[PDB]
Amino acid sequence: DEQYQKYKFMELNLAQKKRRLKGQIPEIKQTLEILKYMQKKKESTNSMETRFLLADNLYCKASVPPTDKVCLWLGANVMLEYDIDEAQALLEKNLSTATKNLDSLEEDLDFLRDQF
Amino acid sequence: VQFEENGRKEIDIKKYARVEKIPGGIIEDSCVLRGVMINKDVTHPRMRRYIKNPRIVLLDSSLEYKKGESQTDIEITREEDFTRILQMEEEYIQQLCEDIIQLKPDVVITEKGISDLAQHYLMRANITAIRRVRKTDNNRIARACGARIVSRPEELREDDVGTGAGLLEIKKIGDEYFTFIT
Amino acid sequence: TIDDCELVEGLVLTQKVSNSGITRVEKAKIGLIQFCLSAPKTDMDNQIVVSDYAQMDRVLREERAYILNLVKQIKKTGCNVLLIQKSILRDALSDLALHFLNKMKIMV
């Protein structure tokens, strides 16, 4: 009866959630390890010529001093800047803890939805 | 109606005339108009009517303002091109309609679309254009006014397109005005 | 014409070879071929997604080395022209391998 159609609809509307969530996960990873690996040591050590994004297609050479200043945005209106040690502390939860719930609400949710 | 001929005075089939379908009035006084008559499209007169300006002209030219001449091209891409295109269309249409003055008509007959930049020039020149006529109407008015049907202008001159004064009235039999080439 | 018919020793056959000094060759060593001279073929011409834009390049850059080893083996065999079997029961032949085997003056 309707079981097949509703099962397929639930699978589709939860696979879209899967795609979206593992869509934002990679760049927040990048935000963590890019900084924590390169900048936290080398920029805190000495100023170097660098590459920064001018746009998502225009890429421009740059140089950075030990600025050690970083800025986070969650929207088009609200901004906060941070140091180079607490910023990764606040960012690391937003993926390390977020994956456990969101992906369990994905893997375990799929396990249930195969019967739900 | 014998000027059309094959070596001698010979009228062709009823298609060379045209019936009328007025439901109003009375059948007791019904008659037939002297000359050609336009119907089932005209319901209100032109903005200049009851004037008498000689040498009726008739065209079948695609005189509409558009990207091309006889066809419509793709949407404009160079946004600056519109300023140039408006002026070029204005000059081109005015140059075409200049030779309409050679006849000085009261009514211009256009099977294709008459254009507002042409109609503005005509009203500045005290001329009017009737639009949306049928294919047989081209020959009908051409014979009635003493002309040959010409697709595009500047191939026209007096006594070869049109004869005498253009004396036309628009009036209603019933609730709708009809164009009467009287 | 009819009169220009002639008896010919050896073999004559329609054109295949181009841009390989096709004018003439003396003592042309002719080698029969009944084996593949192209990349391996399967359900697709590759074993990965045909949209893996970065990946077909990085795998066929060594597949080109493979076919280059094949044509170099043909060279050290001593061939001057090649004799390739009927095609339908075999994979096609890479024309770039033909281009390489042209430059040391070998036809197919």
Binding site: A55 | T43, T72, F82, I114, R131, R132 | -
Partner: protein, 107 residues
């Protein structure tokens, strides 16, 4: 036959559906421009400031903010008046064609 003339009148209707879209796109973008102008006039009260295209932020002084809040908004302004002087032409093209097709072609 009247088939090609009917094709022309439906093409005129398609041009109407072009007209409404081409005016509404610019009036929404102009509303966004006015909102941005109000915001930029509000925020000039403070000095140490950055602007860019969103994907970057360039430092400047206050007079640069005054210059930029005008030099691009005035281009959008000249462009809106260009689009009225275009929209009037094309809306004439559609409306007068309707006036001379609908009560005419049904004959």
């Amino acid at each position: 036959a009247f088939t090609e003339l009917q094709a022309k009148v439906i093409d005129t209707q398609q041009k109407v559906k072009l007209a409404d879209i081409q005016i509404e796109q610019l009036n929404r973008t102009k509303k966004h421009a006015h909102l941005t102008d109000t915001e930029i006039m509000t925020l000039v009260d403070e000095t140490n400031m950055y602007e860019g295209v969103g994907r970057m932020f360039i430092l400047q002084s206050k007079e640069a903010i005054h210059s930029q809040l005008l030099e691009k908004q005035k281009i959008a302004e000249e462009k809106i008046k260009e689009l009225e002087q275009k929209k009037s032409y094309l809306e004439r093209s559609v409306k007068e064609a309707e006036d001379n097709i609908r009560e005419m072609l049904m004959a």
